[PDB]
Design a protein that fits this description.
The structure is a homohexamer.
Chain A: E1 2-4, H1 20-26, H2 36-49, H3 57-85, H4 114-117, H5 144-166, H6 172-200, H7 219-226, E2 232-235, E3 260-263, H8 288-297
Parallel strand pairs in A: 2-3
Helix pairs in contact in A: 1-3, 2-3, 2-5, 3-6, 5-6, 6-7
Cofactor (chains B, C, F): Mn(2+); Ca(2+)
InterPro entries (chains B, C, F): Ferritin-like, Ferritin-like_SF, Mn_catalase, Mn_catalase_dom
GO molecular function (chains B, C, F): metal ion binding
Chain lengths: ~300, ~300, ~300, ~300, ~300, ~300
């Protein structure tokens, strides 16, 4: 079972302008083959299908726990996309919008028109080409080492895509999210690397970084490393998966410092609210009436 | 953010033997268009994309919270499928399996061979025809009423599929899961129905049940309702979504009794471990050595 | 625009019992790449996209008209599949069905479980492997000769699939539909062949039949040819497409006899009603009440 | 069985210029998840699979009939797309086009290149992202009420997409089509709503409009409502489905006026002919010879 | 079994600038429904599934051989796409690239962002809309005549797409490739046409050209015809498929001249190397170290 | 460019009879995500997209060359599937087949009906669930180490699928192909492992085998290793890729013996001809006339 905390894993800067194509690119990091939806569903199903949940407990704890962090990862990337697509972030009401004026005219020429037709100027479960995320992006073989090897590759491939998208947009919201998830993804790659080292004797972490560029060279990532977040494997559980430290220990591939397990989730930041977008009829063409109904419920 | 509890939403019975085709059918309830992956992802993304999270908080609380319960739903259906595919449930080691003997011969003729090739005799993110779940099964328009209407339909369609699969498999593991999720799905349909009633004045809950057959006619579902589960909307959060009672109140479509918000998750049951299946090399052909490595980690 | 007549293109016999796998195979002839959905959508879109609707009218008439017949083709194949899936064809009500008895147990082991889960034991827009029909099965280039060449190939490929399915299912409902559509498909291939002959001078009809087996060897098809159906190109329109005879003339590839344009649609047969299937909750678990509501509508 | 009338459901204005991206957006209304292909195929298959065709005749008449109108809907949207992609609308011949000059250069940068590569600058069976329409967009459960509930939702979702596309392009051809289909779609939503009301007692039509904006506020839609088209449910059949009036009666959700069944199809307008586009080799690079062959057939 | 020669089927001009959208369009000729991947896989599988490999040897030789040439066709189109996406063609190292500067900013607005996210600014197995090539684009019925008819259509449809893409970009690399493959594709269409003529008596080659425009009117294609390449059916095999001449003989649909079988593959040209693209971390962020490792291996 | 030799990479035994479901399972090894189509296309495109073809030649040689061997791999698996689907292997003509007798009746109930409808009882570009192979199964990042890591994983995952299918089908044709490709796949994994060791210092080959079961335990694979095939990296080129030995050297993960580069392709075995299947109209309903036409071509 799962519980939810109404907070993003980190505080994101408020968007200052809509950037459709930046959002379209960031989608690759959400619903693309190596987006957070894939890291999420791969570990989630592997955790469900895990054989030897007690006999190989440290490894089960690891996959089950990281799968839980991934839920926060898709949430964070979705909030980033929504920030890039929000017309009036944080504003509950905008009046005077008239469909006849073609208020969505700009969307006719952007890469991703779905964001404005299927979505109400919001995130969708797809990649940078509009391809919807699909279950075949998941690998759950039941063989522990094979799955771990897949996961190590999965994380470094995912990192590569984040670095490339980072180079496509200088948008502060997108780069803040990328900087943080580069660090978190790096922790996961290191964790699976350590898991493989313990089971096979092969020094997988010595292969890092892939590509051969350090996260320390990415300002937004360095910011979080300076706070020590590359050393933390958060235990996203009230009382379970307490044996993470048996694998998550030793040197960090980033700077060689000792890594540690942090019981409980990160502090986090507030959730994001794109506000009212009348042209998208979201949450309603004119939500005044609905806001009154909600008020009366109290 | 989210937290995880290593417990299934309910305790599942143990299967007498493997039933591949039963597992193949149950997949429709996991990765199919109206499977739990769809209810999960629809509410999850709608919650992310929700506009007016504070101004329309009662409704946001509802979608955000139910989305969290859906995580337990996919987990439960996956556990059911894994139970149906497990050769030695609860057994850590089986020795003597020889690939030359064609130990997976039976799998050559079952409906879903992927369960035994791509999966190590375990669940996959797909439906009853092998179709992988996809993001287009998600509807997130940004318009509250439109999304709620979609969700009401989504749950009754999902219920219909569970009823049909219930009639295909007599397996107690499958029927226990279905009985429970019929009740939970009913709570969600009722919740979205009440939300629509408050926003539009249209008495959506009076349309229930759909199809026109009561959950009380399904033995397993009836038991869970006798335990009062049709009245419960669990607040799956440490401190958030505390306004669920503003919408989740009034009569239950099942028996007209007063519904209630339950603080926190239910106790549930233990997670499932399919055990060792050497032919599937899961968790390893012979996990003896890996088990020793694990033991040594504890020093 | 279009109009509808509540009649199948031909009368279909009634099945002795359900045959799920026969229905699964026949789906290839509906939603598969070369199923009737493909001939329908290819000609339908080509007709919409046709350039020179007046300057090349004889050819536009042909594609626009055949596209209309294709609507009857998907309807007929769907009716065949529904017949094979019907538990109580022609019966409005069956009482006593209890989900607890696992009334759909047999469906757990058939090839296509979707027919019983997503569908209420009815046709779906897919092929023989559960693959849903998709728009990329359509070719609409805007170039007349290229489209016509594609269409000629499309029909003979479609014929090949029908012949193969004919050899898989001995069911009279399936074979009656196939015998008829082999003849109709043959008329279309002949028509596109004649169109190509007029535009390029290449004697495409002399390549027929493909495969090299005559429709006369298929009993059901032979009967329809004995009724003269291989000579008929029906003008499925009240007043339009009156120039079909400019291309649809001359010898039939089947027997060398003069082909003819028939004014209007054939009489056909009655539509099919699968009846009540309580286990599938179709049209309702127990439709008694709904039937009363319907009766009351007439006052 | 079916018959065809060589007319669009309504007369469309002639396009004055090519607008590729407008056409790309309008595709969402044709081959997208909630495009006319979906309303068409959903009702068409439901009508085929209908159980109790006589015992529940009024409802069968309704679905079977509306499915027939939908055929005209995909035809109308396709004509709209073709109008937006036509270089020389209504002109049988253009000479002097030389491929070496790169006459399709502009298409290299438009959103939908398929329109010009796979299609001969014509409509395709896909959505706004190039996604081809697929059979999983169809819901045919065999359960009457469940199907009707799905259809009610389907129509209001489809309306929402039309409103959004309407706001993306001020193109007269696209807006004329959208205005008319907003009205027709509204009739269908109202019809399914009334069907549900008769079978369940739940006042579904009271939920309209969704989104909360009236079609009367859309000039092109208001135009057709002023002609009374929101009150008409046309019986697209020579002699069948004569019991539509048992469900289609009472007040219109638009203005509360009495709705009625109109026997026979609407008058309609002429079909559209995009003319010759040599660069697309449609209908031929130079159709002069083919035109002569056709002439001789007469 | 197969062997490989490290040469492109023809020498290609070096790209003078990156042209993302041109590359996106050319993808239709690679992974699109009628791209070289389709001609390749259709003939390849038909050759595997061929019944009567000896009893119908001339026809088997034909399909098995052309399938082999198609391998060079996907290679040539891929090299063309890579040429259009190469930042520093032929250069092993570029220094000073800093991700923080958003060096891939331009890619945020191009049609195909996948080229820069999933690919390292390189070709992908997809079409012009980002659709990945799929096995359903293959037709292998086992019936010889049906397959040959399909192949004749396949080649003329493929030609049509090449002509359309040719008209979308005046890029020299793309047009050189298109000119050559128009000629090679024409040979294949003629070959299948002749095969059909021998088996059915129907003069299929008389239907050419389709569309009704001659390759001689395309400068780049005429260039290769003047060298006589439209007359050559190369036998891509050391010692097998020696009976091609039984079908490949007689007049060429292009100019009526006698066609001939050429034993062995064409001379070809050098392979293409897109060089170092640091922003894409290809072959590495900074390959200096890897180049040294390779050097030491020698 | 490429050249073709009309020989399979190994000689395959002849099947005793058709085994449709065995063929359906083997399809996973051809068109499935980890089938030979994936190893082929991954290396093929990586070789096209390779940057630093001269500066990193040893690695380019490796990928370009193995990609060429993969062509023989898809050919071999296709031949295995065709063998399992052949009614009259090696027989040019069967007379008397009558479609009316429902000669393909058995196919109505097999897992993969597409083999008999879309295919003329022959291989298709798909997996074990009918899913068609697609380009997204290809990973070509342009980054050498990332691609090599992917390839190492790709081969061991592919091996795992072959081992599972080996346990599903006891058919000698399937097991001979699997035994051989387990060995060849092992060589490729070893090769990519050695490439990674040279570029990163990480001893990837020490992770082998995955799963933890030796190929020596599979009879058919053991035989090929006894013939020394696990040591061979064939240079599938007339004059190119002559630097394979710079990486393909040292100990074999199988037995620690010195691996070697073999100049040119192996002798292999004859290609497979499924013969005439009249019910499938392949190569023709009755090929008598076509055979005469072919004979006459030789004058």
């Amino acid at each position: 079972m799962f519980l939810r905390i109404d907070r993003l894993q980190i505080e994101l800067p408020m968007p200052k302008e809509q950037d459709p194509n930046a959002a379209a690119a960031v989608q690759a990091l959400l619903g693309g083959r190596f987006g957070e939806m894939s890291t999420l569903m791969n570990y989630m199903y592997q955790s469900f299908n895990f054989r030897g949940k007690k006999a190989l407990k440290p490894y089960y704890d690891l996959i089950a726990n990281i799968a839980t962090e991934e839920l926060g990862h898709i949430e964070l990337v979705a909030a980033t996309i929504n920030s890039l697509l929000a017309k009036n972030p944080g504003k509950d009401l905008e009046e005077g919008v008239d469909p006849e004026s073609a208020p969505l005219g700009f969307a006719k020429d952007v890469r991703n028109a779905a964001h404005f037709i299927a979505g109400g100027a919001n995130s969708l479960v797809m990649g940078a080409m509009g391809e919807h995320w699909n279950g075949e992006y998941v690998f759950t073989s039941g063989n522990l080492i094979l799955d771990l090897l897949h996961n190590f590759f999965l994380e470094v491939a995912a990192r590569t895509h984040k670095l490339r998208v980072y180079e496509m947009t200088d948008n502060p919201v997108a780069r803040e999210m990328i900087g943080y998830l580069l660090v978190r993804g790096g922790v996961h790659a290191a964790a699976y690397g350590k898991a493989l080292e313990s089971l096979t004797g092969v020094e997988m972490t010595k292969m890092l970084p892939i590509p051969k560029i350090d996260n320390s060279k990415i300002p937004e990532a360095k910011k979080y490393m300076d706070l020590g977040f590359h050393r933390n494997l958060y235990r996203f559980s009230p009382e379970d998966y307490r044996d993470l430290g048996l694998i998550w220990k030793g040197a960090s591939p980033e700077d060689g410092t000792e890594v540690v397990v942090v019981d409980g989730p990160p502090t986090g930041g507030p959730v994001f609210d794109a506000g009212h977008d009348a042209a998208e009829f979201a949450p309603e063409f004119h939500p005044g009436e609905l806001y009154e109904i909600a008020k009366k419920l109290y």
